[PDB]
Tab-separated table of C-alpha atoms in Angstrom:
chain	number	residue	atom	x	y	z
K	394	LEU	CA	-3.534	-20.716	-35.813
K	395	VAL	CA	-6.162	-21.035	-33.082
K	396	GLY	CA	-3.805	-21.973	-30.312
K	397	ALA	CA	-3.220	-22.619	-26.626
K	398	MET	CA	-1.688	-21.142	-23.481
K	399	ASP	CA	-1.287	-22.204	-19.850
K	400	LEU	CA	-0.661	-20.068	-16.780
K	401	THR	CA	0.221	-20.876	-13.192
K	402	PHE	CA	-1.221	-19.090	-10.211
K	403	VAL	CA	-0.393	-18.187	-6.622
K	404	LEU	CA	-3.042	-17.664	-3.944
K	405	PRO	CA	-2.409	-17.118	-0.214
K	406	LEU	CA	-4.340	-18.665	2.642
K	407	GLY	CA	-4.109	-18.039	6.345
K	408	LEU	CA	-1.348	-15.470	6.263
K	409	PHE	CA	-1.172	-12.569	8.673
K	410	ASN	CA	-0.546	-8.977	7.705
K	411	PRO	CA	2.542	-7.304	9.205
K	412	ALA	CA	2.045	-4.974	12.124
K	413	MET	CA	2.647	-1.738	10.248
K	414	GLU	CA	-0.087	-2.740	7.784
K	415	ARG	CA	-2.817	-3.777	10.231
K	416	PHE	CA	-4.398	-0.305	10.001
K	417	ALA	CA	-7.750	0.629	8.558
K	418	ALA	CA	-8.029	3.468	6.080
K	419	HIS	CA	-10.919	5.041	7.967
K	420	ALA	CA	-12.185	4.514	11.490
K	421	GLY	CA	-15.891	4.094	10.989
K	422	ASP	CA	-16.292	1.256	8.475
K	423	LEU	CA	-16.818	-2.539	8.439
K	424	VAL	CA	-18.719	-2.237	11.728
K	425	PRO	CA	-21.379	-4.838	12.625
K	426	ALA	CA	-24.626	-4.415	14.497
K	427	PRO	CA	-23.799	-2.850	17.887
K	428	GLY	CA	-23.943	-6.147	19.820
K	429	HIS	CA	-21.589	-8.170	17.616
K	430	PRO	CA	-17.993	-9.304	17.904
K	431	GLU	CA	-16.118	-7.627	14.943
K	432	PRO	CA	-14.648	-10.821	13.412
K	433	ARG	CA	-12.480	-8.824	11.018
K	434	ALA	CA	-9.629	-8.712	13.554
K	435	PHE	CA	-9.311	-12.500	13.431
K	436	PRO	CA	-6.855	-14.665	11.501
K	437	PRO	CA	-8.219	-14.938	7.958
K	438	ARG	CA	-8.953	-18.528	6.980
K	439	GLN	CA	-10.571	-18.011	3.573
K	440	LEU	CA	-9.788	-16.615	0.147
K	441	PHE	CA	-12.308	-15.528	-2.466
K	442	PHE	CA	-11.958	-14.925	-6.191
W	1326	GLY	CA	8.539	-22.791	-17.662
W	1327	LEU	CA	10.941	-20.403	-19.410
W	1328	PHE	CA	10.456	-17.665	-16.839
W	1329	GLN	CA	9.809	-19.925	-13.788
W	1330	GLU	CA	6.937	-17.702	-12.681
W	1331	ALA	CA	3.275	-17.582	-11.702
W	1332	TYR	CA	0.643	-14.954	-11.662
W	1333	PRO	CA	-1.479	-13.478	-8.880
W	1334	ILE	CA	-5.140	-12.858	-9.605
W	1335	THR	CA	-7.823	-10.676	-8.121
W	1336	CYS	CA	-8.340	-12.260	-4.732
W	1337	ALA	CA	-9.116	-10.964	-1.271
W	1338	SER	CA	-9.587	-12.366	2.194
W	1339	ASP	CA	-13.167	-11.097	2.515
W	1340	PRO	CA	-15.953	-10.203	0.070
W	1341	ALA	CA	-15.917	-6.791	1.747
W	1342	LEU	CA	-12.638	-6.156	-0.001
W	1343	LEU	CA	-13.777	-7.825	-3.210
W	1344	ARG	CA	-16.642	-5.390	-3.694
W	1345	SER	CA	-14.110	-2.568	-3.568
W	1346	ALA	CA	-11.969	-4.561	-5.995
W	1347	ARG	CA	-14.392	-3.784	-8.821
W	1348	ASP	CA	-13.635	-1.059	-11.393
W	1349	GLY	CA	-9.923	-1.596	-11.164
W	1350	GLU	CA	-7.166	-0.787	-8.729
W	1351	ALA	CA	-8.185	2.887	-8.540
W	1352	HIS	CA	-9.812	2.757	-5.123
W	1353	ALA	CA	-9.716	-0.832	-3.855
W	1354	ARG	CA	-8.994	-1.254	-0.140
W	1355	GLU	CA	-5.668	-3.097	-0.311
W	1356	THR	CA	-5.835	-4.033	3.365
W	1357	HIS	CA	-7.832	-3.622	6.570
W	1358	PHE	CA	-7.596	-4.749	10.262
W	1359	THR	CA	-6.265	-8.219	9.341
W	1360	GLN	CA	-8.018	-8.503	6.019
W	1361	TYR	CA	-6.074	-8.213	2.829
W	1362	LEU	CA	-6.553	-8.024	-0.920
W	1363	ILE	CA	-4.398	-9.013	-3.857
W	1364	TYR	CA	-5.210	-7.147	-7.030
W	1365	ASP	CA	-4.595	-8.898	-10.364
W	1366	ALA	CA	-1.226	-8.857	-12.137
W	1367	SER	CA	-1.324	-10.986	-15.250
W	1368	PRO	CA	-1.518	-10.980	-19.032
W	1369	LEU	CA	-5.248	-11.124	-18.278
W	1370	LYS	CA	-5.274	-7.570	-16.898
W	1371	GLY	CA	-7.463	-5.228	-18.880
W	1372	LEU	CA	-9.516	-8.134	-20.208
W	1373	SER	CA	-13.105	-8.998	-19.345
W	1374	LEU	CA	-13.252	-12.657	-18.287
V	394	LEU	CA	23.338	8.314	-29.712
V	395	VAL	CA	22.539	6.321	-26.593
V	396	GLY	CA	24.128	6.916	-23.219
V	397	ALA	CA	23.931	7.415	-19.506
V	398	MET	CA	22.470	10.049	-17.208
V	399	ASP	CA	23.811	9.414	-13.719
V	400	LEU	CA	21.715	10.950	-10.947
V	401	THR	CA	22.494	10.508	-7.272
V	402	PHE	CA	19.534	10.210	-4.922
V	403	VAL	CA	18.992	11.322	-1.330
V	404	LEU	CA	16.729	9.576	1.148
V	405	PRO	CA	16.400	10.810	4.718
V	406	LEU	CA	16.078	7.735	6.902
V	407	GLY	CA	14.768	7.470	10.434
V	408	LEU	CA	14.372	11.209	10.985
V	409	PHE	CA	11.583	12.754	12.995
V	410	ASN	CA	8.494	14.883	12.412
V	411	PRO	CA	8.945	18.529	13.470
V	412	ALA	CA	6.810	20.162	16.124
V	413	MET	CA	4.152	21.578	13.822
V	414	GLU	CA	3.221	18.713	11.509
V	415	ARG	CA	1.956	16.071	13.932
V	416	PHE	CA	-1.681	16.167	12.842
V	417	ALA	CA	-3.957	13.642	11.146
V	418	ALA	CA	-5.947	15.782	8.618
V	419	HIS	CA	-9.176	14.044	9.779
V	420	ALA	CA	-10.391	12.404	12.979
V	421	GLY	CA	-10.883	8.814	11.970
V	422	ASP	CA	-8.103	7.604	9.681
V	423	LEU	CA	-5.103	5.282	10.059
V	424	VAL	CA	-6.827	3.653	13.036
V	425	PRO	CA	-5.852	0.194	14.343
V	426	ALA	CA	-7.977	-2.634	15.610
V	427	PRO	CA	-9.153	-1.616	19.107
V	428	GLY	CA	-6.667	-3.738	21.083
V	429	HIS	CA	-3.594	-2.476	19.246
V	430	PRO	CA	-1.046	0.254	19.966
V	431	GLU	CA	-1.311	2.329	16.722
V	432	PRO	CA	2.403	2.068	15.870
V	433	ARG	CA	2.416	5.330	13.916
V	434	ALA	CA	2.895	7.277	17.146
V	435	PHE	CA	6.564	6.401	17.675
V	436	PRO	CA	9.626	7.553	15.662
V	437	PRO	CA	9.843	5.658	12.384
V	438	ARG	CA	12.860	3.590	11.405
V	439	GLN	CA	11.367	1.788	8.425
V	440	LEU	CA	11.455	3.237	4.937
V	441	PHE	CA	9.615	2.285	1.760
V	442	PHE	CA	10.273	2.987	-1.907
I	1326	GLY	CA	28.758	16.972	-10.771
I	1327	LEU	CA	27.851	20.443	-12.040
I	1328	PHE	CA	25.056	21.549	-9.707
I	1329	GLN	CA	26.647	19.554	-6.857
I	1330	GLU	CA	23.062	18.442	-6.315
I	1331	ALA	CA	20.859	15.372	-5.994
I	1332	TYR	CA	17.187	14.545	-6.071
I	1333	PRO	CA	14.629	12.715	-3.927
I	1334	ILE	CA	12.212	10.034	-5.071
I	1335	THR	CA	8.800	8.830	-3.986
I	1336	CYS	CA	9.443	7.455	-0.525
I	1337	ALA	CA	7.737	7.339	2.846
I	1338	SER	CA	7.764	5.774	6.273
I	1339	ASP	CA	4.649	3.622	5.878
I	1340	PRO	CA	2.956	1.415	3.321
I	1341	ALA	CA	-0.179	3.302	4.334
I	1342	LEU	CA	1.492	6.445	3.106
I	1343	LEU	CA	2.820	4.713	-0.003
I	1344	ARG	CA	-0.675	3.566	-0.976
I	1345	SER	CA	-2.442	6.907	-0.853
I	1346	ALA	CA	0.490	8.587	-2.641
I	1347	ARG	CA	-0.318	6.551	-5.734
I	1348	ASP	CA	-1.741	8.121	-8.929
I	1349	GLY	CA	0.207	11.256	-7.951
I	1350	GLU	CA	0.129	13.920	-5.280
I	1351	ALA	CA	-3.427	15.180	-5.901
I	1352	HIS	CA	-4.201	13.737	-2.471
I	1353	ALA	CA	-0.710	13.018	-1.099
I	1354	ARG	CA	-0.754	12.175	2.588
I	1355	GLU	CA	2.428	14.156	3.118
I	1356	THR	CA	2.568	13.962	6.909
I	1357	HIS	CA	0.958	12.021	9.758
I	1358	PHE	CA	1.357	11.703	13.579
I	1359	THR	CA	5.107	11.031	13.484
I	1360	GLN	CA	5.261	9.757	9.948
I	1361	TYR	CA	6.205	11.605	6.795
I	1362	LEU	CA	6.304	11.324	3.030
I	1363	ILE	CA	8.388	12.717	0.199
I	1364	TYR	CA	6.810	13.126	-3.174
I	1365	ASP	CA	9.308	12.763	-5.998
I	1366	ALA	CA	10.740	16.058	-7.220
I	1367	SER	CA	13.084	15.221	-10.043
I	1368	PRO	CA	13.852	15.432	-13.746
I	1369	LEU	CA	12.444	11.884	-13.644
I	1370	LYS	CA	9.053	12.906	-12.267
I	1371	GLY	CA	6.153	12.450	-14.629
I	1372	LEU	CA	7.761	9.442	-16.294
I	1373	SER	CA	6.819	5.796	-15.926
I	1374	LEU	CA	9.882	3.866	-14.822
């Protein structure tokens, strides 16, 4: 009665968010040091979990 | 096999979304500039590991 | 003792904000990446449900 | 067919508006620059499905 189960998983890489959803929820957030390039507007190449 | 399905887990394009992903889907930033999060949807939801 | 309640639904689609309600409720919110048009300023045609 | 009436549902012009109108209308972003939102007013409000 101690058993087993398998699951399958889906993870996205490299996709790009549609243009209506490229917003930020607030303006002043995820800002670097004032001399730095803001790499958050780049194509995402990673995925963490 | 019987449902022909797969499950998405808690994953996000940056750690900056993954910190907000803690304590549930109450207040997690689902997206940003180009950065995007996928909250869990699984039999594993609600569980610890 | 089982049966059907049939309810018709109404969705206004592609209409336009009247002259009073064009505000933002805070300064910095729903802001795009800095080289982007902020597409929320034109009449909407999309609809989500 | 008796009231000659119909009802709205939860619908909006943006996914940004659909996100913050989730857990109910305690903080419903009802309107924005051109955008708009309709919170569900219905005999079906308050229920799950």
